[PDB]
Structures are given as C-alpha cells and as structure tokens.
Design a protein around this ligand. Structure first.
Ligand code: VO4
Length: 298
C-alpha cells in the first residue's frame, strides 16, 4: 500500500533520497527542436524543454514549435498536454494548440505574478467586453462568464477560429493559491479542485487532452497530473495496492522532463492520492468534506 510505504519513508525521513532516486532514474530524451536557435524566444526557461518524441506540433508551415508535451498514460487511458505559461509572443500558439488538439479544458496552477516576478502572459481576457484576437493564428477569444471562489476561479471562454468561423467553449480552471515550488494548502483543497475539473468533462475521452500548465509546466502541473492518473488507475481496478505512485511518475517523465520539482511535492502527491482513495473506494460523502474543508466560499 501507499500508506504503509508513505509512513516508512516518513518515519526515516527519506523523502529527499526517494525523490533524488526518481531524478536519477528519469528518462533522458533529445530535445533538439526546442534548442534550435529559431525557437529561443519560444522557451520561457532554458532548462525546461519538451522531448522531440512527445512534443505538441502546431499545424502551421512556418514554425510548428511550442513548449508543450503530450503525456499519454496508456494504462490509465488518459492524456494530458503539459506546457509552460505562454510568453507574450506565444499566446497565439497556445490557443492554436488548444484548437488543433481539440481540448475542452485548460488548467492553470500559477498566478500571473508570483514572488514579485512575471510568470505567465495574460493570455485570456479578464473582461467580457474586451475580447482578445491573436492575429498570427487567426483566433478570437472571449470571456463568457467567471465563477470566483476563494482559492480558485472557473472561467467559461469562447474560442473562435476566425478562418472557419466555428466556435468552441473552453473551460479555464485557475488555481490561485499554489505557491511555485510549493504544495497546496491541503489534500482537501487540492482534491476539491481536481474533482471540479473532472466534473466539467474537461478530462473526458470524447475531448482532446486537457491542457495543464504553470510557469514551467513541470512542478505543479506534474503534481496535478500524477494525482489524477493514480486515482484513475485505482478506480479502474478498485485496487489501491495495485498503484505504484513512483512508477507512474517515472512513466510520466518519459513524456516530459522534471515532472514534480521538489521532495515535498512528491510527498504531497502521496497525501492527495491516499486521501482521494476514500472517494474512489466508495465513500461518496468525502467529496463534500473536501468542499467544506476547502472553504471555497467568498
Ligand atoms: O511553474 V511550475 O515550477 O510548478 O513547473
């Protein structure tokens, strides 16, 4: 079980060592395209790139590069696109990717400003009456409605392909209290947010892969994706003990480097999966406990 293992690691204080072992074992694949000179201004961080084999290619002839990876969890049968926070020059690419990949959901785990520094472009409209138009990729984006909670906000956006004039609803889930290189305030508030995304249909197989990002797209994004997949695996078999959290993380790291950035984030993942297992194993009421414990109201 995760619990037994969690307490063994906890009792000896081996999280840093456990986490370092994962770093050491992680896949190392080429990122030749991300490192091309022409793509320099398309990367937010020098040391965070998508592998060539799993990168999302934009469907344009000019330059198909974007810092984004497709994480295809074969056994869990769920896919995620993890990407960096868009730069001022890549917002059009970001939405082009959303359109071409047929995504319904965008999960954002960072704030535009964190620790006094700018971490992400303002890539979506904050006012209904001020829609955005990305001239390079011929897309229009409109804020349709906003539901503001205490530590997250849900937005309904309308994305229009100006070329074909067809439109789509995009759901934007914005977690506003998850510090960079940090952990959520609680398993409860994190799980409450995760289940809000799930309940929107954004994670369903009839849609393209959900887009998950923070600033770099590996730490908080990794943490979010890891928990979700572990709970999905457990759900499929109704067998908590069949899930090897570290193996899953390692499987995810075949598709994008550096997923989960700290030992504490790893520790949190265990917590979130362990708490979430109560819901998966038949205690439907625990979801309401999370909502309360999370204090989303206000
Ligand atoms: O902006 V993230 O450092 O949690 O990859």
């Amino acid at each position: 079980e995760m619990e037994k293992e969690f307490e063994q690691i906890d009792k000896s204080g081996s999280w840093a060592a456990i986490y370092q072992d994962i770093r050491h074992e992680a896949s190392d694949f080429p990122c030749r395209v991300a490192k091309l000179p022409k793509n320099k201004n398309r990367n937010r961080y020098r040391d965070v790139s998508p592998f060539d084999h799993s990168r999302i290619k934009l469907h344009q002839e000019d330059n198909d590069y974007i810092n984004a990876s497709l994480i295809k969890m074969e056994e869990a049968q769920r896919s995620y696109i993890l990407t960096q926070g868009p730069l001022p020059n890549t917002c059009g690419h970001f939405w082009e990717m959303v359109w071409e990949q047929k995504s319904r959901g965008v999960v954002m785990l960072n704030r535009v400003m964190e620790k006094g520094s700018l971490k992400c472009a303002q890539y979506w409209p904050q006012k209904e009456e001020k829609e955005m138009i990305f001239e390079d990729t011929n897309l229009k984006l409109t804020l349709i409605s906003e539901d503001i909670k205490s530590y997250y906000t849900v937005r309904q956006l309308e994305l229009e392909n100006l070329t074909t004039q067809e439109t789509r609803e995009i759901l934007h889930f914005h977690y506003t209290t998850w510090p960079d290189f940090g952990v959520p305030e609680s398993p409860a508030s994190f799980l409450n947010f995760l289940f809000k995304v799930r309940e929107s249909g954004s994670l369903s197989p009839e849609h393209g892969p959900v887009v998950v990002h923070c600033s770099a797209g590996i730490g908080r994004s990794g943490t979010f994706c890891l928990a979700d997949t572990c709970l999905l695996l457990m759900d499929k078999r109704k067998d908590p003990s069949s899930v090897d959290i570290k193996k899953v993380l390692l499987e995810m790291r075949k598709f994008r480097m550096g997923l989960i950035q700290t030992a504490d984030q790893l520790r949190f993942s265990y917590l979130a999966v362990i708490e979430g297992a109560k819901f998966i194993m038949g205690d439907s009421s625990v979801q309401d406990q999370w909502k309360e414990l999370s204090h989303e109201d206000l």
